[PDB]
Amino acid sequence: MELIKGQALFLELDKKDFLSLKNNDKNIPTFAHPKNQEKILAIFSLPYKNPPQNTKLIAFYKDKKEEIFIKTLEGNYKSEKLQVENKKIFPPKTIQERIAKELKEANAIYSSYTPKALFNGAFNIPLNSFITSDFGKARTFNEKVASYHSGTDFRAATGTPIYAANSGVVKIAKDRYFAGNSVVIDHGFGIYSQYYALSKIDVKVGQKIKKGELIGLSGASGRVSGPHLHFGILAGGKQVDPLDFVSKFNAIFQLEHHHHHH
Ligand SMILES: [Zn+2]
Secondary structure, eight states: EEETTTTTEEEEEOOEEEEESSSSOBBBBOEESSOTTTTEEEEEEEEEOOOEEEEEEEEEEEEEEEEEEEEEEEOOOOOEEEEGGGTTTSOOGGHHHHHHHHHHHHHHHHOOOOOOOOOOOOOOOOSSOOEEEEETOEETTTTEEEEEEEEEEOOOOOTEEEEOSSSSEEEEEEEEEEEEEEEEESSSSTTTEEEEEEEOOOOOTOOOOTTTTTEEEEEOOSOSSEEEEEEEEEEETTOOHHHHHHHHHHHHOSSSSSSSOO
């Protein structure tokens, strides 16, 4: 199999006598295929940054082992040059404790696995065909610093209402240093959706949220300048192309075949 770096893949395996799916030492959790009761699923994701050239997974069954080979593809990522506030790439030493704190909090959330579906059918995606910066765009900040885009940016006037892409539990709902007013929702199965750069936050941590419920208003408080929604997905432990992820998830989990938007 082949997978573009920075993308997720839904792996389908026989359910009968299955024990474990392992990358190297890492256990990859599995969950029931929602339509085919002879199959189970796992989410496998490749990092955008420094991915392996090839991956070998092993599925352990009671009486056999199966090897799954995945070759990393480079894809067709583009690039942009951006001017940002200097503080966003050179934070003063005195604020780096706050950044380190917010990193530890985020890591605790993403390393906590919810072994049940909190979502409800397909993810909604924004009704918006003006992507100002796609996932994985290579970036040069202020002519000298490099990065890559870890989510997808949609042109939106400040104050555009933002609705949860699916049901789940809110895990983050505050201003964070780099990407501003931020909401993160746990959907179960290690799937998290992210909404950054907001001007207003209308949810609170621990709140159960339904698909299509208002979580805030779009803003211009993010790392990059300009009014936009930053939308992200973390799945399989990695930031992945969120529009691509939603397309693959929805093909499996949608309850109706119609168009999925709020
Ligand atoms: Zn962004």
